[PDB]
From a paper:
The polysaccharides in red algae (Rhodophyta) are primarily mixed galactan agars such as agarose and carrageenan. Carrageenans are high molecular weight polymers having a linear backbone of repeating D-galactopyranose units (G) linked together by alternating α-1,3 and β-1,4 linkages. Furthermore, transcriptomics revealed upregulation of the CarPUL during growth on ι-carrageenan, while biochemical analysis of eight CarPUL-encoded enzymes revealed carrageenan-specific activity, thus associating the CarPUL with the ability of these pseudoalteromonads to liberate energy from carrageenan. Detailed analysis of the enzyme activities encoded by the CarPUL, combined with interpretation of growth phenotypes, have allowed us to propose a refined and detailed model of κ- and ι-carrageenan processing by some Pseudoalteromonas species.
Despite extensive efforts, we were unable to circumvent generation of this inappropriately matured form of the protein. Therefore, to provide insight to the specificity of this enzyme we generated C84A and C84S mutants and attempted to determine structures of this protein in complex with neocarrageenan oligosaccharides and fragments thereof [Supplementary Notes (section 4) and Supplementary Fig. 10a–c]. The complex of S1_NC C84 with ι-NC4 revealed electron density for the substrate that enabled modeling of the non-reducing end disaccharide. The ι-NC2 represented in the model spanned the catalytic machinery while its poise in the active site revealed complete sequestration of the non-reducing end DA2S residue in a deep pocket, showing an obligate exo-mode of activity on carrageenan chain ends. Though we could model the G4S residue of the disaccharide, S1_NC makes no direct or water-mediated interactions with this sugar residue, or with the G4S sulfate ester substituent, indicating a lack of plus ( + ) subsites and that the minimum recognition requirement for S1_NC is a single non-reducing end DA2S residue.
Numbering used by the authors:
A (entry chain B): 36 to 507
B (entry chain A): 35 to 507
C-alpha cells in the first residue's frame, strides 16, 4: 500500500509555470513535473470549486453525487456533499490508510473528519453544518466604490489584487505548509500507510500576496494574450451577466488587469516556494523516494481573456484547462499530450491504493498512460467532457466536448451554442456555430457529445436530442 | 345541470388599479362584474411569475408536485413544458363532456391546450414546435445599454418600459383576442354541450404598449406615486439588487419615465375594461350571460417602481404577490371576501362548479363556501396565504412567504437575509424588521405557521427550513 500526497491548489491555471514555458520561474514544481508524469492536456470537470472537488474525490459526475454547484454561497441550494458519498477518503480509511487533510475542503463543514480523516486544520474544520449561504454584501459595496472611481490602499483594488502586510511566514499558505510538514513528520513515525491531502487557498482571487511576491513581477512588463480586453462577439448571454459582484469589470483599467496578472504571478511564485518546503520535508523524513504524488489545480482563472475575471458559467481553455502532475516513483517520466479529466483522479487513486469499488467510475485510471505514454490510447478518440450545470444558484446545464482541434459548447439555457476552431483560433475569439464551412465538424462534435452523455447516463441527453435534432 | 364557465385571465394585472377598488382607472365593465359576483379583495397569487402561477391555477397543485416551478422557454430556465401527465382542469373538463376552448397566452409549453383536448382557437403557443431553444433577450440587453448611455427611443419614450403603438384598438393583439373570444361565445351558443372557455390576454404585460387614445388617456404629470416609490432598499435581500432580466436595470429611469410607466399601464387597464365589456356584451347577445359562471383573475401583479423595482423578480412584495380576483356564480348574492385566498383555490372552485374528477391532490380549497356565506365561512381559522418563488428564469431562490392581515415573513434560503414586514404599521413594506427583537413573538408565530404550511403541502424544503429556523424548533 503506497504512501500518497495530493497537493491541490484553488484556481491555479495550466500555463503559468516555467516547465510550460510560462512567465513565472517555478523550479520546485518544474522538478516534480520532470520526475513524474506531466498531463499537459488535463481538463477539470467544471470551472467551479465544489463540483470540481466532488468529481475529484468521488470519481463520479455531479448528476450522480448530487454535488453539482458550489456549497454555502448566494444563491446555491447546496450545503454539503452527502455523507452517503464516502469519497476516496472513507474508501482509503476502510483498508487501513491514515488519512489527513489540511486546508480548504469546500464540500461541507467537518466533511473530511466525518469521512474518517484527521482534519488537522482548515476553514471547514469546526464550522456548524447547514449554515446560511455566504451572501457577498461586502464585495457588492466594494465594487460599487470601484464604479464610483474610488481605489483602496496604494491605488490597488482589493476585490482583484492586494498587497498583504507582513511576510510569507504570516500567510495562510505558510500555515498550510507547516500543517503539511507536521503531517509528513507524523506519518514517518508510523508503520501505517499514509494518504495526505494539502488543499491550498492560493491562488484564489483576489490575488493577495505579501512582499516581495507582491512586486516580484512588474505590471508594466506583463505580456497580455490575444483574447485580453476584447468585446465578446456572438457569445452566449451568461458571459455578460454580473453573477458575482466582482464580475463587473466595467471599471478596470489596463493597469488594473496587468496588476491582476502581476499579483497572480506573485502567488504562483509563492506557491512554488511552498511546494519546495513540503517536498524538502518529505526528503528529510525519508518519505520522498517512495511517495506517490498528485499536483493539481481544481480549475483555472480568467485574467481578462474575453474581458472576464475569476470564473463563471463558460468553458474557455484558461478556466477549463488544469495543471496536473502525477508522480509514480516506479515509472520513468513522460509527457502525456492526450486529454485527461478530473474524473480520472479517483480511478488513479483506486489503482495505486487498491481502494474498494463504491459504485461507478465515470473516468479511467491514468496508470496505463503513465507507464506507456500517449500510445496507451492509440486508436481512441482524443476528447474531454466538461460540465457547468450551475453557477452559485444559476442553472445553465452547460456541456462542452473538446478535441485537439475543435470545441463545441452546448448552452441549453440559451439559443446560442459555441463552436471554436482551436487550431486556427486557440484564443476562442470567433464563435463559428452558424458558419456553414464548419457543418461537418459541428455534426461530428454533436455525435461525440451524444455518445458522452449516453456513456455517463446524463438525463440531459433527452433535451440534447431535441436541441440537436437537425443532426440525428 | 353542468355550468358554462368563462375565465378571463390577464398577464401582470395588479389588484389595485380598478375604480371598484378606489383605484385611479375608470373600469366600469370590470366594476359591473365585481358588483354582480364575489369580490376576492385579498386574493394572492402562488408565485410572481407566469408559468408557475398558471400551472398552479390550472392543475391545483404546487410546482414541487407538478415539476412546473419556473417560467418555460426563457433564458436561463431548465423548463420547456408542463408534463402531458398533468392534464389540468382542461383534460379533466374534456373527459366529462365539456367543449374546452383556449384563446391567447398558454405559457405552459407549445400546443399545450390542444394536447389536453381543448380547441386552441388562437395564441402564440398554438402552432409552435415543442422543446424550442429558450428565448434569450439579446435585443432587450442592447436596448438597455442604449438607455444607460442616455438615449431615448422614438418620441422621448423608452420602449422596454412604455410605448405608443401605431393605429387603433382594432389593430391590437387585444382586439384579436376579443374577436376570438366573440367567436368562442357564438360557437358555444350553438352547442348542446357544456362550455369551458379561457381567454388569456397578453395585456397588461410590460412594456406598457397601447395605441391612442389609451396611450395618453391618463396624464403622466398627474400620477400619484406611492410612499415606497423610488426608495433605496435598506436591509433587503441581495436578489432584489441583481439585474435578472436586462430591463431590471432602472438606474437610467427619470421620475417622468416611472410616471409614464404608470400612465401607459393605466391606459392598458382602460383598454382591458373595453375588451371585457365587448365579451360580456357578446355573452348577453348570445343568451349565455344569465347562466355563465365567470372567473376574472390576473396571474400576478407588476412593480411600477415600488422599492425601485420594475416588472417582477424573486421577491414577495404586495404589488406583485396580490392579484385581482372576481368569481361570479349567477345563483348567489354578491359579496366582498376580505379573507385571504390563493391561486391554488381556483382549480378546486372549478372542480366544485363542474364536478371534475380527482386527478390527485388539491393543495387549495374551494371558494364556494366563502362565495355563499362571506368571510364568516372561515371563522376560527388562521387567515394566511402561502407564496413561493422557487425560481426566476433559471435562478434558484427557494423563496417562501407567509402573509397574515398584519404581518409577512419571507424565507430567502439562498441568502443569509430573511424579510419580516409589519403590514399594519408599514403596509408599503419599507422596513425589514427581521433583526428587530421587538418582533421576536411575531417572527416565532410566523416561522411555526410556515413550518405547518410546508408540512401540509409535503414541500421537501422543510428539512432545510428546520435547519435555518432551528432557534425556534
Ligand atoms: O466559500 S468559498 O466559495 O470557498 O469562498 C468564497 C469565495 O469563493 C467564490 O468566489 C467567487 C464566488 O463564487 C465562486 C467564485 O466565482 C467561489 O470560488 S470557488 O470556490 O473557487 O468556485 C471567495 O471569492 C471569497 O474570497 O471567499 C468566500 C468565502 O465565503
Ligand atoms: O415567453 S414569455 O415570458 O411569455 O414572454 C417573454 C416576456 O415575458 C417575460 O418578461 C420578463 C422576463 O421573464 C418574465 C418577465 O420578468 C416574463 O414574463 S412572465 O411571463 O409574465 O413571467 C415578454 O415580455 C415578451 O413580450 O416576450 C418574451 C418572449 O416570449
Ligand atoms: Ca477553485
Ligand atoms: Ca404574468
Amino acid at each position: 500500500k503506497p504512501n500518497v500526497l495530493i497537493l491541490l491548489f484553488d484556481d491555479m491555471r495550466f500555463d503559468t509555470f516555467s516547465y510550460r514555458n510560462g512567465p513565472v520561474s517555478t523550479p520546485n514544481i518544474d522538478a516534480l513535473a520532470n520526475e513524474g508524469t506531466r498531463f499537459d492536456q488535463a481538463m477539470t470537470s467544471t470551472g467551479l470549486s465544489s463540483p470540481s472537488r466532488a468529481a475529484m474525490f468521488t470519481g463520479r459526475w455531479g448528476h450522480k453525487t448530487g454535488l453539482d454547484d458550489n456549497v454555502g454561497l448566494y444563491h446555491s441550494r447546496l450545503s454539503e456533499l452527502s455523507l452517503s458519498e464516502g469519497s476516496v477518503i472513507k474508501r482509503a480509511t476502510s483498508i487501513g490508510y491514515d488519512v489527513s487533510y489540511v486546508g480548504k475542503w469546500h464540500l461541507g463543514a467537518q466533511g473530511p473528519a466525518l469521512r474518517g480523516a484527521n482534519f488537522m486544520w482548515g476553514h471547514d474544520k469546526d464550522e456548524e453544518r447547514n449554515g446560511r449561504p455566504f451572501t457577498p454584501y461586502q464585495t457588492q459595496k466594494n465594487v460599487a466604490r470601484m464604479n464610483a472611481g474610488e481605489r483602496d490602499k496604494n491605488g490597488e483594488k482589493h476585490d482583484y489584487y492586494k498587497t498583504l502586510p507582513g511576510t510569507y511566514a504570516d500567510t495562510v499558505t505558510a500555515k498550510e505548509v507547516n500543517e503539511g510538514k507536521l503531517m509528513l513528520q507524523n506519518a514517518a513515525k508510523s508503520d501505517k500507510p499514509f494518504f495526505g491531502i494539502v488543499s491550498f487557498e492560493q491562488p484564489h482571487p483576489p490575488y493577495r500576496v505579501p512582499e516581495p511576491y507582491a512586486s516580484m513581477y512588474d505590471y508594466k512588463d506583463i505580456k497580455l494574450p490575444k483574447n485580453f480586453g476584447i468585446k465578446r462577439k456572438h457569445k452566449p448571454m451568461a458571459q455578460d451577466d454580473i453573477w458575482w459582484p466582482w464580475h463587473d469589470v466595467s471599471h478596470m483599467s489596463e493597469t488594473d488587469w496587468r496588476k491582476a496578472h502581476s499579483f497572480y504571478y506573485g502567488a504562483i511564485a509563492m506557491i512554488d516556494h511552498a511546494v519546495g518546503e513540503l517536498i524538502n520535508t518529505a526528503k528529510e523524513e525519508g518519505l520522498y523516494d517512495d511517495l506517490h504524488i498528485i499536483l493539481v489545480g481544481d480549475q483555472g482563472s480568467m485574467l481578462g481573456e474575453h474581458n472576464l475575471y475569476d470564473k463563471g458559467p463558460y468553458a474557455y481553455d484558461e478556466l477549463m484547462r488544469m495543471p496536473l502532475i502525477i508522480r509514480d516513483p516506479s515509472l520513468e517520466p513522460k509527457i502525456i499530450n492526450r486529454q485527461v479529466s478530473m474524473l480520472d483522479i479517483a480511478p488513479t487513486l483506486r489503482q495505486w491504493m487498491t481502494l474498494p469499488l463504491d459504485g461507478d467510475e465515470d473516468g479511467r485510471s491514468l496508470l496505463p498512460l503513465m507507464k506507456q505514454g500517449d500510445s496507451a490510447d492509440a486508436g481512441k478518440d482524443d476528447i474531454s467532457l466538461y460540465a457547468y450545470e450551475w453557477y452559485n444558484g444559476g442553472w445553465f446545464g452547460i456541456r462542452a466536448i473538446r478535441t485537439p482541434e475543435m470545441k463545441f459548447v452546448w448552452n441549453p439555457g440559451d439559443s446560442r451554442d459555441e463552436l471554436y476552431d482551436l487550431k486556427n483560433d486557440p484564443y476562442e475569439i470567433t464563435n463559428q456555430i452558424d458558419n456553414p464551412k464548419y457543418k461537418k465538424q459541428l455534426t461530428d462534435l454533436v455525435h461525440k457529445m451524444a455518445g458522452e452523455l449516453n456513456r455517463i447516463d446524463d438525463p440531459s441527453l433527452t433535451k440534447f436530442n431535441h436541441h440537436m435534432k437537425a443532426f440525428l
